[PDB]
Amino acid sequence: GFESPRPYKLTHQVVCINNINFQRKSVVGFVELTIFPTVANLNRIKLNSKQCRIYRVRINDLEAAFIYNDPTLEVCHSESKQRNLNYFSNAYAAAVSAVDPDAGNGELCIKVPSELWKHVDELKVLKIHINFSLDQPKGGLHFVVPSVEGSMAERGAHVFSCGYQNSTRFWFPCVDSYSELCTWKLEFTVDAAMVAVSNGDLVETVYTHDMRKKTFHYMLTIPTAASNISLAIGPFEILVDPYMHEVTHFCLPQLLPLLKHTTSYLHEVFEFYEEILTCRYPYSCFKTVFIDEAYVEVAAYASMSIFSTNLLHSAMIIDETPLTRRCLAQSLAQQFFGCFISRMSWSDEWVLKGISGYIYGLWMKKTFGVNEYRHWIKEELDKIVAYELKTGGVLLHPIFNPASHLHFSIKHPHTLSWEYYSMFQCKAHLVMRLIENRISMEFMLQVFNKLLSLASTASSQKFQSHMWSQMLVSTSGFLKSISNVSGKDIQPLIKQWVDQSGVVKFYGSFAFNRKRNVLELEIKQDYTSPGTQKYVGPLKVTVQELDGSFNHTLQIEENSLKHDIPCHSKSRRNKKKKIPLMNGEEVDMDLSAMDADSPLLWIRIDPDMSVLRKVEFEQADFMWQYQLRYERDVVAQQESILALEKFPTPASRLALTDILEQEQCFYRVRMSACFCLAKIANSMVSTWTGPPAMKSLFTRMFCCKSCPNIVKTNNFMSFQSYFLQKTMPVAMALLRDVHNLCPKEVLTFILDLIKYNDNRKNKFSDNYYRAEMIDALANSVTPAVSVNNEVRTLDNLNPDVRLILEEITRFLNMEKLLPSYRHTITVSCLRAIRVLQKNGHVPSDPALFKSYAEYGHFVDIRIAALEAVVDYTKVDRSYEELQWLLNMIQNDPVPYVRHKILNMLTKNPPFTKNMESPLCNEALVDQLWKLMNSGTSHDWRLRCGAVDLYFTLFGLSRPSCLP
């Protein structure tokens, strides 16, 4: 049951936009809402509006009086001397709650005229006509206007609606909540050479009487929220999908072949999401818009998605096809379960984020294989256990503070840190995988189909929300639908992993009792760390003995420590028979390293990742080597690679080398075995016999049979030896001699890989392989032996580093004339120049990176150069570079770059709270408090980034470096 927090119900909204002026960056328009009051004596009506100048408001064609105030413009007063962050977080939460449409509130308060009170008490319709104007928007609509001359379509100027969550208040007045569903009528009067893309279906396109402008009329009969309404106006090249004909793809001019190749996969994503769920795609059209200077890499609205143009690749670009493919896939998953089925509160957001991430993981499983699915699930689980042990924990479904261990309030999406938002979505889809583990996948897809079917029976009624609230899901409704389809309720699993905000830590060690033939496990939990919680459920453990692989369920109550499980025979060591594996197959194992008295070959605690856990198991090194070689699970091979770094014995070198030589191993395991072999080789110097590690293996796999030092000409058509070939010198460059310097046998090998590179014969590009070659050249740089702080000049350069510097100069200059796909070699060469500057080789001068961080460059070059400037101002304690970065945060045209500068200055801070630095003035505290209070008031993501930066630099209490 859904009861509105608003005293009115909104039925229909007309959004008309005229006079989109690109020179002046200005729009004019009106908005006409059709509300039905649910309570008599409505009097004031409270709507949401930011940055719009409200000209006039007429209610039922009668002139009404409005008052506007935004408390989130300046959160705390300018003349308050408070400088602690808990004060700002409480004031910011109160300010966002005072404009919240999820309460009854709002920023624009319109007073109902007196003569309509007899129209409002007996509950009859009210039609509110606001007309507004955006004079030069700092948020919401982003105007990308290039400085080439010509007409606005000839130079490539466009507008798009940017922002996250409820940010539609930034470009027209609305009820900007996900729970106020209404039908829509959208008119946009644009130039005759431009096209206006929006939500709904385009009913017509009429000309103006001078035929210089045309009006696009859109209609949206599926009741969506105001937060799902978008806009993209530009000189877009239109491409109808040749497979599905209601799907149109819009790109920027001159990028039509890239659009043709890139969006050619999307029909398979549509077919997948419509056959695992049994509902068809709910909207009547689908539109993909590719734009420049995007807010996020992929945004999903109702019947529309806005991607950045940096996803567009051609047919000869690999290492970008899977990333763009999965961006399209998660946009479509959010089309199903973020835009059609919406949110009932700010709680129950974990339901939608979990269903979107879970069905996108099912797509990844079918498309890229179960092994890529397991690797992705393991990397997401490692991400969340790292974040939750780092700071507190992520609390899905809080109850309204519920989480006081962290420096922001979790009551609203616009007060969350961006890393918390990312980990929120990550934990939501892992908890949905856990619900699939308890209640099987076919019942899970039946739950999702029941939600979609209730929403689509709801979506066709005309009753104003008598039935339109069946399109809003809640937690209680989701659990009730689960209990309807399965008969089991998941309330212990919901109580543990949703309502409780923690992950578990397992420390395991075994001992084999030879007398009674049992395996005594010893599993203890660390439950006193700040991020942890105590697990009391069951726990699966998989033991591989000589007779095969056996699963055991252990009951781990609070007082439990020793778990005795039984062991089988050892009669497959009496005769040589094959040892049967986890799957149905069996292999020949070399049992010379195994103990004579124990049959068990390896043990895995929680193999299926059925809890949110971090396992620290103490096996013997031969058990880790057997688990690396003969396991049929990629997460166990990865964890054995990760645990073999502590055992540098030559049997582990043989194990990793046999993994590296082995095709029919998953390629991301061999790419990890490269770096593990490099670390082991560095640890057993003065024992290593022959050549450096992986060199003979590289010449055996990727070089000519007649010439060992000449590499084969590039043929990248295998896509697994391409990735292994481009990752093996990067790990090989981490080799070090007894003198702690990279050997001149590996550096010469990398330089010969660079010289003899011929790419005139493959059908694929070479930009990522050459960029990884520059990364391998950067990995070999050891710190220089400066004497008496000698100035680093050209004559006293290292003889090794002069070759590296010549190569990166040649590569960067050739990129200036023949550019790569996304300037990957510019990014790699800037990263390598920063590596050479971090050691004492090149003079520590930020002027090159400051010239590459200007506005007109590509955004990857910009963020690489700004990363180099952030690293410089951390190491050299530069005041003027920090003022340069803070000025670039305040006034840069691209808001993604501002968010990225705040992000990089949070990750690599110039000082922490513990450090005494020269950059701990009252002036810097006043600048960052002014940046939290004012200055970042237009983005909701820059303000949370400024809160994160103030927390990283000065902590939760009063800045110490202050009177």
């Binding site: 080439v148 990028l255 690749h313 000869m316 510097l805 796909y821």
Partner: peptide, 25 residues
């Protein structure tokens, strides 16, 4: 300037056209 000269970075008015577009096709 004699040893290791770098061509100076010039800003483009539209950078995606010189980044994303293929030149040999």
């Amino acid at each position: 300037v004699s040893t290791f000269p770098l061509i100076a970075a010039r800003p483009f008015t539209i950078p995606y056209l010189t980044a994303l577009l293929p030149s040999e096709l």
